[PDB]
C-alpha cells in the first residue's frame, strides 16, 4: 500500500507541556509500516472545541545514522487553521527519508512549540508513502 493510519485520540494542552515535553512521540512499530517502503509526507489531523488558529512546530524522527545521534528534524512550519479541525503536513526530504528508522523503537515526534488554542486532540497521524 501506499499509507498507513492511526488514530491516538491523544489530548494535548499546550500550556501543562514543560519546556522539555512539547515533542509528542509515537512509535513507528504502531502504524505497521515495513523498513522496505519510504515515507514522503506526515500529516497530523488535530480537532479542537472552538477555532484553532495558529500553530508552529517541527517534526522529528530517529534515523540510522549515528554519526547525527540517530535523529533528525525537519523545517519549522507555520500554519492557520480557520476552524475547529485541520491538518499538519511535513514533507519529508529525500536524505531523511532514505535513513529513518523505523524499527528498534524508532519514532515520529510531533512538536508544538506554540498554538492558539490551547486544548486540541490528535485524531490521526498519516504516513504517505513511496516505493521501488
Given at each position: 500500500?501506499?499509507?498507513?493510519?492511526?488514530?491516538?485520540?491523544?489530548?494535548?494542552?499546550?500550556?501543562?507541556?514543560?519546556?522539555?515535553?512539547?515533542?509528542?512521540?509515537?512509535?513507528?512499530?504502531?502504524?505497521?509500516?515495513?523498513?522496505?517502503?519510504?515515507?514522503?509526507?506526515?500529516?497530523?489531523?488535530?480537532?479542537?472545541?472552538?477555532?484553532?488558529?495558529?500553530?508552529?512546530?517541527?517534526?522529528?524522527?530517529?534515523?540510522?545514522?549515528?554519526?547525527?545521534?540517530?535523529?533528525?528534524?525537519?523545517?519549522?512550519?507555520?500554519?492557520?487553521?480557520?476552524?475547529?479541525s485541520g491538518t499538519i503536513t511535513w514533507k519529508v526530504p529525500s536524505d531523511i527519508s532514505?535513513?529513518?528508522?523505523?524499527?528498534?523503537?524508532?519514532?515520529?515526534?510531533?512538536?508544538?512549540?506554540?498554538?492558539?488554542?490551547?486544548?486540541?486532540?490528535?485524531?490521526?497521524?498519516?504516513?504517505?508513502?513511496?516505493?521501488?
Amino acid at each position: 500500500s501506499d499509507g498507513y493510519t492511526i488514530k491516538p485520540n491523544k489530548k494535548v494542552t499546550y500550556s501543562a507541556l514543560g519546556e522539555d515535553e512539547r515533542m509528542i512521540g509515537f512509535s513507528y512499530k504502531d502504524f505497521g509500516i515495513s523498513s522496505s517502503e519510504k515515507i514522503t509526507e506526515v500529516q497530523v489531523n488535530i480537532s479542537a472545541n472552538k477555532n484553532i488558529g495558529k500553530y508552529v512546530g517541527q517534526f522529528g524522527t530517529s534515523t540510522t545514522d549515528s554519526a547525527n545521534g540517530y535523529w533528525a528534524m525537519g523545517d519549522e512550519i507555520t500554519q492557520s487553521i480557520s476552524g475547529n479541525s485541520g491538518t499538519i503536513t511535513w514533507k519529508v526530504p529525500s536524505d531523511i527519508s532514505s535513513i529513518i528508522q523505523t524499527q528498534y523503537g524508532g519514532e515520529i515526534k510531533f512538536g508544538v512549540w506554540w498554538i492558539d488554542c490551547d486544548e486540541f486532540t490528535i485524531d490521526s497521524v498519516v504516513l504517505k508513502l513511496e516505493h521501488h
